[PDB]
Amino acid sequence: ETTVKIASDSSYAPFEFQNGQKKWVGIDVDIMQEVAKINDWKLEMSYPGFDAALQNLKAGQVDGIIAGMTITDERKETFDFSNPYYTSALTIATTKDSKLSDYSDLKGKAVGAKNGTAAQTWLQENQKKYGYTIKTYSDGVHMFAALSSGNIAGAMDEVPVISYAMKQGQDLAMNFPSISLPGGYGFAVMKGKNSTLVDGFNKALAEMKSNGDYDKILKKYGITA
Amino acid sequence: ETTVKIASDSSYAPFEFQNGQKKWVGIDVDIMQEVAKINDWKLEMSYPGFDAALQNLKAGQVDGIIAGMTITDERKETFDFSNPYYTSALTIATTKDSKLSDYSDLKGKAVGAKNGTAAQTWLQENQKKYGYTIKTYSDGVHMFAALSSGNIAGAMDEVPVISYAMKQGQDLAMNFPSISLPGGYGFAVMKGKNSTLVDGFNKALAEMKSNGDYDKILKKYGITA
Ligand SMILES: NC(=[NH2+])NCCC[C@H](N)C(=O)O
Ligand SMILES: NC(=[NH2+])NCCC[C@H](N)C(=O)O
Ligand code: NA
């Protein structure tokens, strides 16, 4: 009944990614599809990439974005957000048999993050305090390979990313604290616009938490912390 | 197996509280029981109240504390902590049919909080910014009854506490932004003592986060990790 165009990232597991059949799957895909059905929306998903999705949203070529997008006060100056649909935390992953548990245990060790991330910033801000060296990576495939090889002692990323990788059978544990960003992940529209879409998102999310569909989706993608 | 004596609060749902059959339950209870099992400890829980628990810990009558205890610099002068096992936050609960969605909407409205809480402090610190009046309550039963009756327009409390109240079927919604409580909640021992207990807690938490048991426990009380 109402056509709703949503843009998303092209590859950001477990939020949105293609499986082996090239079907779009992930937490964001499954949530958005169920929200649309609850609200009687005809959903038209596109996957141009995070940056392109933002460009398209601002130009009015799409109506909203869901793309592992952390809610921040700066972003709220441009966008209106839903209630968060998942908590947004960071953590340092280790290999499965690692006994590292505390930040002081990284002294003298190398710790990875992806270039241009909150994780990179945290590591930079805490390097002198705990005495590790930092290694920067292009993507998760390279960072986690380095962790499994022992070339780094830890890899800092978003908790859902590490959880998914773990569920897939990667050699990983979550031995360190979760560092919370308060915003959570949100559905976004342009500021002042499409408040009915945000409200339908909010109402559907509440129903899904209530009826257990929300928890089914998280467990499908191995999201446990 | 060695006996481990742990003290907690007497009523802090959903962390520790007595249910309808008068059984001690909650996130802290379930986590501590699973940590003990993982570590082959015989756990002896007591529930004298937070302040009594600190007294008992300082006197050597118990070995540790779990009681939604914020990790703070002040506290770290007396106590050693585990990695935080949960990071709480503050937000405004409204009735389910309330249309309020942001702090600016509270101008000219009465907003409640419990006496002697972070929520109260936050409200007092932000009153001039948003322009509400503050009403103080002894406990949750009283604050939430005032909200349901329309005598207050919102109630400031912790996300986990509101989440559980909603699970129990109270007429509540969480449509406002959250305010992070720096530190997270940790397991505590006397400074320099009982390193075995802190290490056992850290390693067991990592296993429970890694194997899904941590998530299952939160979900039982309506909380998303
Ligand atoms: N699909 C994505 N890469 N989304 C952005 C992920 C990084 C971070 N959560 C952010 O909001 O900036
Ligand atoms: N009944 C309660 N709400 N107890 C709260 C006391 C613990 C509080 N989070 C603190 O760290 O000081
Ligand atoms: Na906290």
Residue numbers in the entry:
A (entry chain B), B (entry chain A): 27 to 251
Please, what does the article write about this entry?
The adenosine triphosphate (ATP)-binding cassette (ABC) importer GlnPQ from Lactococcus lactis has two sequential covalently linked substrate-binding domains (SBDs), which capture the substrates and deliver them to the translocon. GlnPQ is an ABC transporter involved in the uptake of glutamine, glutamic acid, and asparagine and was found to be a robust model protein to study the mechanism of substrate delivery from SBDs to the translocon. SBDs operate in a Venus-fly trap mechanism, where the binding site for a substrate is located between two lobes of an SBD, which is connected by two antiparallel β-strands (the hinge region). We report three high-resolution structures of SBD1, namely, the wild-type SBD1 with bound asparagine or arginine, and E184D SBD1 with glutamine bound.
